[PDB]
Amino acid sequence: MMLPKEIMMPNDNPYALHRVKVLKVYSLTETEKLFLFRFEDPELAEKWTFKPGQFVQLTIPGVGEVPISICSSPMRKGFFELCIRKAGRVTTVVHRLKPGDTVLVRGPYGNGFPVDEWEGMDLLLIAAGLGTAPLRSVFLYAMDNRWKYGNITFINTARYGKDLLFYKELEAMKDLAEAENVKIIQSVTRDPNWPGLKGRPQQFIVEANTNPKNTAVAICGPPRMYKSVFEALINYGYRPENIFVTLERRMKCGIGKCGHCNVGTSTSWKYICKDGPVFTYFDIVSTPGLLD
Amino acid sequence: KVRIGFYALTSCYGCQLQLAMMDELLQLIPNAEIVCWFMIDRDSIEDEKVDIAFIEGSVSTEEEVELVKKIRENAKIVVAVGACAVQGGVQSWSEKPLEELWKKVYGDAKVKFQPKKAEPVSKYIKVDYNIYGCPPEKKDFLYALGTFLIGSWPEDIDYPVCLECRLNGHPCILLEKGEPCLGPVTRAGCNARCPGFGVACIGCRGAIGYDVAWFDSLAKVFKEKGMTKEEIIERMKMFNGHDERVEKMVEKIFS
Amino acid sequence: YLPITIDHIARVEGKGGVEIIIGDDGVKEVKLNIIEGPRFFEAITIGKKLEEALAIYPRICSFCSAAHKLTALEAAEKAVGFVPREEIQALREVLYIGDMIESHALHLYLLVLPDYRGYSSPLKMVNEYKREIEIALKLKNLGTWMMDILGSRAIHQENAVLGGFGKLPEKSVLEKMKAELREALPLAEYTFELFAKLEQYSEVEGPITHLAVKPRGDAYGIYGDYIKASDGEEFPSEKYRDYIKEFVVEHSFAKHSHYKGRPFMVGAISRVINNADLLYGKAKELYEANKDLLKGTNPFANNLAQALEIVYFIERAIDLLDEALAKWPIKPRDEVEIKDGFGVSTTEAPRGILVYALKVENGRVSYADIITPTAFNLAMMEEHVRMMAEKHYNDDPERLKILAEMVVRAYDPCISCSVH
Numbered sequence: 031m032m033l034p035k036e037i038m039m040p041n042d043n044p045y046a047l048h049r050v051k052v053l054k055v056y057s058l059t060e061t062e063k064l065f066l067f068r069f070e071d072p073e074l075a076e077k078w079t080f081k082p083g084q085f086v087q088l089t090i091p092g093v094g095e096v097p098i099s100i101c102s103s104p105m106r107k108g109f110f111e112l113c114i115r116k117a118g119r120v121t122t123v124v125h126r127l128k129p130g131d132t133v134l135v136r137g138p139y140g141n142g143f144p145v146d147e148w149e150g151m152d153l154l155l156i157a158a159g160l161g162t163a164p165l166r167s168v169f170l171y172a173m174d175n176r177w178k179y180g181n182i183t184f185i186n187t188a189r190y191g192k193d194l195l196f197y198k199e200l201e202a203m204k205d206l207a208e209a210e211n212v213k214i215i216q217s218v219t220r221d222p223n224w225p226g227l228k229g230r231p232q233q234f235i236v237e238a239n240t241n242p243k244n245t246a247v248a249i250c251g252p253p254r255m256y257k258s259v260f261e262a263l264i265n266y267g268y269r270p271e272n273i274f275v276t277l278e279r280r281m282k283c284g285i286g287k288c289g290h291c292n293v294g295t296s297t298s299w300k301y302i303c304k305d306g307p308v309f310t311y312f313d314i315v316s317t318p319g320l321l322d
Numbered sequence: 323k324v325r326i327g328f329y330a331l332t333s334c335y336g337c338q339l340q341l342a343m344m345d346e347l348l349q350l351i352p353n354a355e356i357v358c359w360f361m362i363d364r365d366s367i368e369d370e371k372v373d374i375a376f377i378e379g380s381v382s383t384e385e386e387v388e389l390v391k392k393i394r395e396n397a398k399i400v401v402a403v404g405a406c407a408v409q410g411g412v413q414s415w416s417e418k419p420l421e422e423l424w425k426k427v428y429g430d431a432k433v434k435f436q437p438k439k440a441e442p443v444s445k446y447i448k449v450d451y452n453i454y455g456c457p458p459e460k461k462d463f464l465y466a467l468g469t470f471l472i473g474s475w476p477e478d479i480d481y482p483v484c485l486e487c488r489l490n491g492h493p494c495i496l497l498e499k500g501e502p503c504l505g506p507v508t509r510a511g512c513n514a515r516c517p518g519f520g521v522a523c524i525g526c527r528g529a530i531g532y533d534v535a536w537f538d539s540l541a542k543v544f545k546e547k548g549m550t551k552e553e554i555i556e557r558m559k560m561f562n563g564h565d566e567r568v569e570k571m572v573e574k575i576f577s
Numbered sequence: 578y579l580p581i582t583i584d585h586i587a588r589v590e591g592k593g594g595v596e597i598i599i600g601d602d603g604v605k606e607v608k609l610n611i612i613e614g615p616r617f618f619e620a621i622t623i624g625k626k627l628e629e630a631l632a633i634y635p636r637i638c639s640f641c642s643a644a645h646k647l648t649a650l651e652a653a654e655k656a657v658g659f660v661p662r663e664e665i666q667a668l669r670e671v672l673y674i675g676d677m678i679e680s681h682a683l684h685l686y687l688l689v690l691p692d693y694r695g696y697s698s699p700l701k702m703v704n705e706y707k708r709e710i711e712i713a714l715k716l717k718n719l720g721t722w723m724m725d726i727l728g729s730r731a732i733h734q735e736n737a738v739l740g741g742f743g744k745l746p747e748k749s750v751l752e753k754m755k756a757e758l759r760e761a762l763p764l765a766e767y768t769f770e771l772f773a774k775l776e777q778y779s780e781v782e783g784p785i786t787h788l789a790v791k792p793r794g795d796a797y798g799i800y801g802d803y804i805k806a807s808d809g810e811e812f813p814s815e816k817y818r819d820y821i822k823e824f825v826v827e828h829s830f831a832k833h834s835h836y837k838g839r840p841f842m843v844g845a846i847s848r849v850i851n852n853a854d855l856l857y858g859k860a861k862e863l864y865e866a867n868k869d870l871l872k873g874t875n876p877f878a879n880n881l882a883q884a885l886e887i888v889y890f891i892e893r894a895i896d897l898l899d900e901a902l903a904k905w906p907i908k909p910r911d912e913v914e915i916k917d918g919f920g921v922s923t924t925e926a927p928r929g930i931l932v933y934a935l936k937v938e939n940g941r942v943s944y945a946d947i948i949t950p951t952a953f954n955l956a957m958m959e960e961h962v963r964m965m966a967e968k969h970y971n972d973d974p975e976r977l978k979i980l981a982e983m984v985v986r987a988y989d990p991c992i993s994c995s996v997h
């Protein structure tokens with residue numbers, strides 16, 4: 031968002047960090063934990079609002095900072111949630127955080143999904159692997175604002191059945207969601223012994239309950255699945271002007287100075303922290319190299 | 323308290339001396355318990371359980387291979403300190419076999435102790451982290467010890483000395499005088515000491531890992547300025563004598 | 578019974594071990610086991626380029642890296658027929674004095690002070706003997722900062738190139754160095770008093786052959802062309818192997834040395850005994866006052882001689898800095914062309930005489946011979962440990978071990994330079 035004096039401090043320092051406390055730790059998968067945070071400043075906690083799809087810079091003191099997307103809805107005011115996978119140094123230190131500990135956060139950064147201009151149209155969310163958390167934010171924003179959006183579909187896929195993000199929440203939500211114009215599809219790709227569904231999301235796009243001409247599509251996951259998902263969506267009649275995807279590059283600041291999250295070419299040179307992380311379909315089509 | 327042990331293989335004790343001459347070492351005593359460091363302590367026990375083991379020197383004795391196997395058994399983290407432990411040091415500059423050097427130095431006499439050619443510690447055990455230099459910088463020791471005390475680990479360096487040479491504004495010896503500077507392939511952290519004093523880098527901190535040390539490009543640059551192949555190879559193998567990349571990469575550009 | 582063995586000797590440079598072979602008639606045999614691995618510096622440098630081979634000679638030890646670097650530069654310059662300018666030689670002497678200050682202060686305060694003060698580590702002496710550790714750190718920092726300014730660093734100096742320096746500091750830095758030496762002179766005085774208060778054990782009283790270098794010029798110093806003896810005779814530096822014999826013992830990786838068939842001693846006490854009359858200033862006043870303690874018969878006078886040498890070398894460094902500042906500005910380095918030759922340089926290390934014999938053939942090293950002070954001192958160390966052990970025979974093993982370790986540490990042994 032455009033929060034003043036709390037996103038850049040009264041000292042006008044964009045690198046200034048806010049003190050937050052971890053209240054709940056929940057292990058989703060083996061290398062995955064869901065963290066519930068709140069700002070130790072009550073006014074800052076009550077004033078901090080974000081957009082679905084935006085990210086924050088989580089500074090573990092003495093180790094470094096990492097960019098994490100927000101998975102909770104912005105209308106759950108006071109608290110925000112982060113889902114973090116153990117990939118290396120900083121995340122190894124993060125996974126040792128027990129409730130009641132204090133960590134530093136600045137944000138929110140980037141542009142989220144344009145959920146304000148998605149008013150009065152269907153929602154199709156396609157989440158692969160770790161991309162469920164930003165789409166969890168979008169999904170919970172849609173569920174809190176159900177009267178605004180039409181039929182919504184949530185496709186969540188993972189390599190194994192134990193690596194599905196928010197499997198318990200989405201499985202518990204499926205009842206009364208099927209009656210509330212919400213369809214949840216959860217599938218695995220490399221697990222042929224999984225009792226549930228199997229296959230890639232492009233197989234389950236046909237099983238969606240969304241009107242193809244009036245649907246907003248949000249895709250999050252590895253860059254390699256994007257081309258196949260684009261082919262499937264274009265074949266079924268989803269308009270290319272409504273397809274949105276998220277990309278990841280190396281980030282050190284999140285404000286546009288370190289120059290590490292660069293994509294594109296000399297014709298269209300862009301930065302993830304300033305021009306994304308949400309990109310449109312035509313941006314992905316025009317310049318190669320944004321995928322893989 | 324973190325249990326730290328400093329062990330001496332065949333070395334000049336430069337790394338232990340560098341750690342001992344730091345004024346910040348007085349801050350390590352309240353936060354860490356030094357188990358084995360014979361240079362400063364006399365009550366130090368060799369066979370004890372240490373959280374982090376710092377190993378100095380090359381493996382130039384059979385008893386040293388037994389000691390490093392014991393250290394790997396007894397340590398949760400094994401850290402190789404210095405060029406001698408990381409890449410064999412300057413003792414591995416010569417490719418001549420052990421008996422030739424022994425006959426040249428000690429003549430035809432017996433010592434009853436068994437020596438061997440200088441090899442890095444990584445050949446006999448698994449070193450989790452490395453500290454580079456000869457001797458390593460005080461900043462390297464500070465960063466490594468502090469990150470270990472916080473529970474993290476140091477970040478490996480994959481950038482050349484030229485980075486710190488260009489941050490400090492030092493004149494480039496390779497562009498002006500054509501001197502054989504090994505800086506473009508040597509790991510940073512020394513703040514470009516030798517190029518800042520007008521000398522050329524001899525690569526004490528070692529060549530960059532992760533297969534991004536370009537000896538072929540540097541050999542071509544040296545070849546344009548009138549150096550034979552063997553001079554370039556000896557220069558690059560001064561501290562990188564256990565590197566299999568150097569010979570192949572230079573012979574590629576000279577073929 | 579069983580030998581009394583110290584597998585690893587602490588607060589001593591390098592890896593070593595004493596072996597006291599006990600017997601019916603007191604002590605029977607003493608072996609000084611040197612388990613530090615051989616690095617073959619005299620063989621790995623053969624056939625290597627001269628400038629590149631000089632950069633790795635200071636890697637023999639860290640306590641006397643500047644000693645090795647400057648002695649190697651002297652040997653190489655003698656081989657190639659080059660004469661350094663007077664101001665460059667003065668700055669090299671200041672760097673060598675910095676090495677001597679650092680090594681002597683480090684030895685005295687962190688290796689032979691804790692065993693006299695009843696501790697097992699200088700890190701345990703932070704709260705009780707606070708002022709002693711503070712002055713220790715100040716002297717060590719002065720030496721380290723002199724080496725950082727002149728050489729590239731305190732260990733393995735890189736600014737010392739063939740024919741001078743790669744880059745010389747500005748004049749104000751030299752003025753600050755002189756001011757800091759003036760401030761550190763009282764610390765040297767306190768160090769000398771503190772080490773005069775200590776004890777020279779009478780169990781090791783005996784006649785010693787003291788070898789030291791004859792200084793060049795008319796002052797106590799480090800550079801020299803002649804080697805003196807307590808027996809009165811003197812021989813040229815290049816003729817060292819006619820009078821000194823190197824032989825290999827079957828219990829150490831080092832070569833023991835003999836002088837006329839007998840062990841001898843090199844070090845600070847030998848320097849004082851041989852060249853006492855060349856001292857000037859507060860060093861000469863202190864030597865004249867305390868000549869009774871500085872008898873060339875007890876190896877434990879070496880620590881006091883080191884304190885006296887610190888006192889002398891602070892003033893000597895001040896004077897050399899004045900001489901160098903008289904000729905400002907200074908060109909950092911002279912162009913040296915490498916002709917063939919054979920140069921032998923005997924500069925006086927903090928622990929004794931350092932002999933560097935280098936032969937140059939077509940810009941490359943063809944013959945290298947290094948004899949280090951500890952290799953000189955090992956035979957006398959064995960003899961004096963034998964007499965100490967026979968004096969303290971059949972006592973408690975711990976007391977014998979600690980007293981033998983104190984005798985060994987009196988020689989400030991650098992095991993790394995022994996094997997080179």
Ligand SMILES: Cc1cc2nc3c(=O)[nH]c(=O)nc-3n(C[C@H](O)[C@H](O)[C@H](O)COP(=O)(O)OP(=O)(O)OC[C@H]3O[C@@H](n4cnc5c(N)ncnc54)[C@H](O)[C@@H]3O)c2cc1C
Pocket residue numbers: 085094095096097098099100113114115116117118119120121122160163164277278279280281282307
């Ligand atoms: C917009 C965005 C949203 C993200 N959302 C999430 C999320 O919801 N959950 C989650 O688990 N992870 C998320 N990540 C990835 C997360 O930033 C990395 O897992 C983390 O930075 C790597 O930590 P590490 O300890 O492995 O660092 P190391 O591998 O040790 O590397 C150190 C530095 O590398 C940088 N870095 C490494 N990988 C990445 C990366 N993928 N993106 C940016 N910088 C990186 C960081 O600055 C980090 O400090 C997101 C990344 C981006 C760019």
Ligand SMILES: NC(=O)c1ccc[n+]([C@@H]2O[C@H](COP(=O)([O-])OP(=O)(O)OC[C@H]3O[C@@H](n4cnc5c(N)ncnc54)[C@H](OP(=O)(O)O)[C@@H]3O)[C@@H](O)[C@H]2O)c1
Pocket residue numbers: 099158159160161162163164165187188189190218219220230231250251252253254255256258259276277278
């Ligand atoms: N957090 C967010 O909101 C967000 C947003 C954007 C990006 N991301 C990033 O996206 C990644 C998430 O994915 P992941 O790394 O966890 O993936 P992964 O599980 O390691 O592999 C991709 C998964 O998608 C399946 N898949 C489906 N269609 C595919 C296709 N066409 N090509 C390839 N795979 C296809 C794969 O099947 P196979 O195993 O058979 O290939 C596998 O199950 C993370 O790097 C995450 O940080 C996250």
Ligand code: NFU
Pocket residue numbers: 637638639640641642644645680926927928929931949950951952991994995
């Ligand atoms: N002093 C001294 Fe050394 Ni480390 C010995 N022996 C070499 O100069």
Ligand code: SF4
Pocket residue numbers: 333334335336337378379403404405406407411412455456457458636
């Ligand atoms: S790496 Fe260098 S400083 Fe360390 S022990 Fe080896 S030679 Fe000495």
Ligand code: SF4
Pocket residue numbers: 483484487488492493494495496497503504505506514517523
């Ligand atoms: S002098 Fe050496 S280290 Fe410095 S920029 Fe030039 S090549 Fe790189």
Ligand code: SF4
Pocket residue numbers: 456483505508509512513514515516517522523524525526527528735
């Ligand atoms: S410039 Fe090269 S030789 Fe000099 S300290 Fe740095 S890495 Fe070592």
Ligand code: FES
Pocket residue numbers: 280281282283284285286287288289290291301302303304
């Ligand atoms: S994260 Fe630094 S430029 Fe975007």
Ligand SMILES: [Mg+2]
Pocket residue numbers: 619832946947948949997
């Ligand atoms: Mg020798």
